[model samples]
Target: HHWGYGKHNGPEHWHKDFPIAKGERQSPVDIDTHTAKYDPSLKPLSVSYDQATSLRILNNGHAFNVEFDDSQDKAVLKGGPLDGTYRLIQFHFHWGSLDGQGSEHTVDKKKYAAELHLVHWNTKYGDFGKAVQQPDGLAVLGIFLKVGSAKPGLQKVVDVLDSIKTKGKSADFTNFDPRGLLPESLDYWTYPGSLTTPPLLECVTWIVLKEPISVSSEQVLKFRKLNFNGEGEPEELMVDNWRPAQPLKNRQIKASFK
Candidate 1:
């Protein structure tokens, strides 16, 4: 009844359980920059985030998600590849067991240590659950994470991981604006793809940034300490929690910058 990154239930076998796993618009495909077309019409990304709406962070068995209050239009994303403003819902990360590989999307066959997903839903859809089913319902900004100097801002997020070490555990996380996590340049590659997780709905308009953020080797490895199991359950390391790159079929990866 569950999916995981293992030989028994990994991505290779996902198609048997989820037919949409083999859909045309599956996510996390490799982005070949030389092959990507630069679109002059693409507008610069517009983002507005309110720290007060950042409620808490939770370990949802898969990844540690920092959830935001999407009940209103407080924190929103507009411009770029979107036709309308999308409300910020939550943000999460995917990393490898070790290093040299982890990020779902690759650039010129190069992999990063980790990746961050800032999930947003269209206001036209009203809510995230309902938005997940529509073609243009969701938008996810993907940021690559490299191992280098420690990111001071990310330390706040890392500090809370210990408290939420087990699944279903959470802690109050307020007054945090995600914009600080982004790179100086908002230049990105946009495309239509599905959710990298189960149900694999084809609803995401992926906006993957070209610049990578730096995180300390020590801090990045701490993610491996997260447990997929809860109290009283056999402890399992939540590592290499990423889906393999899918084939890019009939889709154009448009760049916002030249």
Candidate 2:
């Protein structure tokens, strides 16, 4: 909780506490498509999210998150670079103050307006915390957001932003299906990576989508209105809440498409 996206608390200082921040398998690397390997073995991803599993949306300071009832596999993601079932835990968004260029992962040096990470835990461990300590602990699906048309499925989430304006505050959000936020194509690039935030755990299998979902410039602007500080504290606008891309090193990124 001591970590943040401002001043000395930013990504540059995260290495002090989390020594692995500069590790080999670190996340949010530049995805160079020219060197991408098309893996025929990779299968089309399967996302089965139960609308009722969505529980609440919160202001986690760094990002806006919607958590799920991951107690069961009611809302889960499988296939595509995954050898086992991973239960849906939470979905969150990172954005910039401007129209675009807030995305963490850069594709051929092109950055998107925003990006949302769908986090899931491996059900085999039966414990999300313990799972995070393992290399095969989590599977994160990254979907880029371009400045275009308004996203219909995202309206409900955006509507609740007014209520949870401060950090630690949250509102009950139900009957919400995350699958509604998916792009038209499931095509993606898979690689070994870590969580982009502090406690930068390298237990994630990154499956970043090739195609991005369109959300108007106005829609993304609403995200910056939320506060990183608590209700009584000085208001700090939650914008540019994204960690820049790290080194790719020896990692090989595989594209699910041709």
Candidate 3:
């Protein structure tokens, strides 16, 4: 079982309890924008707020766990771009110190300011946990945040973050539209990969957005302010929580774009 609210569950301890967690194929893939080999037919689609029918939020210690209900995206199986028409699952993030770089995927030793993950599951497939065993049952959207204009982008999330900012605190999300938080451009890079976290299911179709959504330094700080250690336990404060980049293992990535 995972750690409960306001409790201590450091990465080291997590691995201690679940040794297998040490080797999950986690995402927020740190990619190089300069080295991208763009695909000619890669057409990125923009999902508007009107398209996202519902929103849910869970308090996950470090950040607010926001999920999108994709039943409203016309619920069609778009082929090729993704092997199946995947339903949007949930979205999360990865961050680091203000003075130091905090991106999971690094290029030439350079890291982005932060990383965000948008998860989707193949609707035709079994549950995400079960479907992850197959190579085509998962689709994950990745976004990077660099130091720039502070337009909370798809981060209508931030407004809700305020509600759950205090440790162990959680609130139902409503009247919030995630689509309005997405960046203007839908350009992205696509590839066949595996889940980057638990179950390490080898089934994932990764789509990393080409454009970045900017959040102010203040916004970034708000995330950093979170206690990596469970609340009330100063010894457990998570000052810097992120995983190092994994070896590409000779895998080639394809970008869909202009």
Candidate 4:
């Protein structure tokens, strides 16, 4: 229950309880483009989303994730290093207080202002629970965020931040199609990785977009305003929710495009 981004209960201390933290394919690894082999066989990613699938946005004590209705295939992602379609369950962000360094998976050591994760569960695995323990159980689409001009696509989500300001707090978030949040390109670097957070499950097939979406600095401030603590708990601002880059081990990052 104490796992957090701070020193005492942060990523460094998580291995005490979840020994798999030191597993073979941990997530948020640094992507060295020089070694990333361009795979001509990797198909273009296909994404189709239903605006109605977005249920609510919640401050889940770590990051604010916009929950989705994944009971069916209303919103799904396919192709690009995936065997079958994956249903979108949620999307969340990880950021720093400043603009210099926040993104989890740095590109050649270049840090972006923030990073967004669109988490999905493999439909072939029955449900989210069963998918969690398999090698190809989850497919998380990572999009980097740079601080720049404000994008209305992001503002819609930012506008609701004040309503769900603390852990366990949530508000009804409806009619927003998150597909608009994606960058222009589907080109990506695919790798075998684990969830950045603990249990540190190594069941994820990471597909990180080469292009990034931009949000204004003012908008990023709203993300920081979120609280890691509960309503009555101490007001701990939800900043630096990202995990540091882990080792690549024997993995190879295959690029969809050069």
Candidate 5:
């Protein structure tokens, strides 16, 4: 098999193709809040987004992603452990076959129903493709999702899911703002980690928010119906598209809150 989330070709077998799968700083680690050290010096996260920057949404065989236009700095994230500006590239999610547990990164061994990844690239590195290879080239903002009230911000994206139900399908998703999806508090845990998917690049600076946004059970269930297979292929639910937590090794997880 080329690469996928199936038992024979899933995260457990990614190391055979991508050596970094077992690298020292691999991602999706189980974060222990009690052990995290508070640093008052950490700057408040600065996020600026322009609704016009949103381009389209696509089903990339693994998850549905809302892509943004990074050509201009219409949307940018800086501060909170970042040395320079990072441009918003895309945002995606990972969920389970059912509810209850599917987040890539867990806290104190507690898994969430889902997780959202807002992918950004350091402009200092030229582009996303090259940034993935550098140590400080990417910053991934991780948000936990819990089942509760329906999130209006997310419903906009969810409403278009039916149009891109199959892998490789895409629809014009414009004028949408991602800032609405963030929680009130930006308190988070910061660490060095890699991507949770294939190529598994160890360049991501993971900034995981402590607060989880509310997403209704019905809204979340829509994501599970997405098919990993493209048109005409045997249909398969795109669920459990998350990797297990990796070893923390000697890394330090810094906190922005007491």
Candidate 6:
């Protein structure tokens, strides 16, 4: 469902758009700090890049989300890390207020400036629709996006945002290695979760990266300023459509290094 505007359309009005989303496995909500924990066996491994991959970019007017084609690592798991061929489906962003503080995933009830999720799946398991039903079917790579002089990895994406300035518009981008946007460190935290949106099935193997990817204030502002009208919608502007963080629900989020 679509997010709310200023008054009738806002985060609070989101449920009106999709009433069922309320009880879903949405995230970045109230994380009971004392109850949060991690596992030891679930480790963050370096994803091999020997295979070929293509990228498709869409200017949804709200954000620039890219869908990955082919290019997936082979099977290699031990119950925790799925040993199946995982294909990167798509990647999107979530930003916060101008003050730069307020995201879904919280560290002891503390929010970050923004967050990005690169959602992937184990094709060896099946399509996203089917794989999302199992606990080890999905792998979501999470990263924190803070505002500052730092050049955000999203800059690579923002560089093409202009291409999709209008709604229902898309463009073809080549020579782009989606991995270039990955944070410098492989350090990350893993856990069993589900898609933050609808069908909130608790079937996600979340890989929350430790190191953050920085983006300058200007780049961050662009995302915040994106519009969702001009073509598709009759008269509505979707701003800051990020879903709030959800609870850890007694699950252990494992980290490999620190």
**lDDT of each prediction vs. the true structure?**
0.91, 0.91, 0.60, 0.92, 0.92, 0.62
Residue by residue across 139-181, what tens digits does model 3's lDDT show? 7677777876786554466656656654566667655655654
Segments of candidate 3 deviating more than 4 angstroms:
1-35, 46-49, 70-80, 152-156, 166-168, 229-231, 235-239
Per-residue accuracy of model 1 over 1-258 as CA lDDT, tens digit each: 578887788898888889999899999999999999999999999888753288999999989999998888998888998999899999999999888889999999898999999999999988889999899999999999999999887888988899999889999999887877888889999999999999899999999999999999989978989988886699989888899889999999999988
From the highest lDDT down, the ranking of the candidates is 4, 5, 1, 2, 6, 3
TM-score of 3: 0.77
Whole-model alpha-carbon lDDT for candidate 3: 0.60
lDDT of 3 at 177: 52
Candidate 2 vs candidate 4: the lDDT winner is 4
Candidate 2, residues 148-247: lDDT per residue as tens digits?
8999999899889989999999999988888789999999999999999988999999999999999977788788899999999999999989999999
Q: How does candidate 2 score on lDDT? A: 0.91
Find the 10 residues in a row with the least total lDDT in model 1: 46-55
Per-residue error (Å), model 2, residue 252: 0.2
State residue 111's C-alpha deviation in candidate 5, in Å.
0.5
Each candidate structure's TM-score, on Cα atoms with residue i matched to residue i, is: 0.97, 0.98, 0.77, 0.98, 0.98, 0.79
Q: Residue-wise lDDT of candidate 5 within 7-107, one digit each (tens)?
A: 88999899999988889999989999999999899998988875338889999999999999998777888999999989999999999976668999999
Clashing pairs in 1: none
Model 4 — which ten-residue stretch has the worst lDDT?
46-55
Q: After superposition, how far is residue 217 of candidate 3 from its true place, in Å?
A: 1.0
Off by over 4 Å in 2: none
lDDT score of residue 81 within candidate 6 = 58
Q: Clash number for every model?
A: 0, 0, 10, 0, 0, 18
Cand. 5 TM to true fold? 0.98
Candidate 5 lDDT at 135 equals: 94
The list of candidate 5 runs beyond 4 A from truth reads none
